[PDB]
Design a protein around this ligand. Structure first.
Ligand SMILES: CCCCCCCCO[C@@H]1O[C@H](CO)[C@@H](O)[C@H](O)[C@H]1O
Ligand SMILES: CCCCCCCCO[C@@H]1O[C@H](CO)[C@@H](O)[C@H](O)[C@H]1O
Ligand SMILES: CCCCCCCCO[C@@H]1O[C@H](CO)[C@@H](O)[C@H](O)[C@H]1O
Ligand SMILES: CCCCCCCCO[C@@H]1O[C@H](CO)[C@@H](O)[C@H](O)[C@H]1O
Ligand SMILES: CCCCCCCCO[C@@H]1O[C@H](CO)[C@@H](O)[C@H](O)[C@H]1O
Ligand SMILES: CCCCCCCCO[C@@H]1O[C@H](CO)[C@@H](O)[C@H](O)[C@H]1O
Ligand SMILES: CCCCCCCCO[C@@H]1O[C@H](CO)[C@@H](O)[C@H](O)[C@H]1O
Ligand SMILES: CCCCCCCCO[C@@H]1O[C@H](CO)[C@@H](O)[C@H](O)[C@H]1O
Lengths: 108, 108
């Protein structure tokens, strides 16, 4: 089945925490990139993650409060109104035929 | 200066050929992915290219008439009306903080 992401919890109190879980990662991965919003856009990149070295590198939209895990999961702490809405994950395969999934939680 | 792409020629007769040139490739590249349109969208991916292995892999929007070169350049032969408009290159860096550039020509 399709690459998918869900957020835990779906509705998050301001100041609390949310984990973006990822399911059905394909094989032969090179890396992951998370973006704020519904689309892949470098200006809105949160983080880039190289699997070979297990190394996270921040993008322009990185808040300082995000952590990516080896299975692509994204933890966000001390959430703000600004964190609310859509997130997009791009999975970079080793053949560079890539996949995206979006991506939502609601701050209250 | 910024990663850019220009098309040669910019206005192309139906049935002829167009080369999408790429300038200012950054260092530390792992590969390239070309998309039809203004955005990175897997459903519209033309090709994925691994630099290390020199291996091109076709995506869903591949027409059969496209060739990617080691410097990311894209040749399109026997162009159709359907080929007209924007193309987007994504450059995949080793730290996964990637870059995109668009991308157009006009068929007449
Ligand atoms: C700090 C706690 C994080 C531990 C990992 C939690 C992931 C548990 O697993 C997830 O549980 C969800 C329950 O809502 C299910 O909907 C998902 O299908 C399942 O993958
Ligand atoms: C103090 C941070 C707690 C994390 C918020 C989880 C809320 C789940 O609760 C719904
Ligand atoms: C607070 C830190 C949370 C730990 C981060 C890793 C937890 C991820 O846990 C994994 O998530 C996957 C989907 O993303 C699923 O395979 C399973 O729910 C689980 O094994
Ligand atoms: C093979 C074609 C290469 C042409 C290089 C032109 C560089 C910018 O030319 C406009
Ligand atoms: C091989 C791909 C076909 C590309 C060759 C046609 C490019 O035509 C270009 O037109 C430009 C108009 O200003 C001229 O400046 C260039 O010299 C010319 O190469
Ligand atoms: C077969 C390719 C011809 C050179 C490209 C020019 C297309 C016409 O367009 C100017
Ligand atoms: C007609 C097919 C020939 C293959 C193309 C040869 C490589 C293209 O040529 C290169 O294009 C780059 C743009 O990507 C430019 O930056 C370089 O200056 C130029 O040498
Ligand atoms: C170092 C890069 C080598 C790439 C191999 C080129 C594969 C595309 O084969 C193409 O065949 C066409 C004939 O129909 C020619 O007009 C093109 O010049 C050629 O690129």
């Amino acid at each position: 089945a399709q690459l998918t992401t869900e957020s835990m919890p779906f509705n998050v109190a301001e100041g609390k925490e949310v984990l973006l879980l990822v399911h059905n990662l394909p094989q032969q991965l090179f890396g992951y990139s998370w973006y704020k919003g519904e689309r892949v856009d470098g200006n809105r990149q949160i983080v880039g993650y190289a699997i070979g070295t297990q190394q996270a590198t921040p993008g322009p939209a990185n808040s300082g409060r995000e952590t990516i895990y080896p299975n692509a999961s994204l933890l966000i702490q001390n959430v703000t109104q600004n964190d609310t809405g859509f997130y997009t994950l791009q999975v970079i395969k080793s053949d560079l035929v890539n996949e995206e999934a979006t991506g939502q939680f609601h701050v209250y």
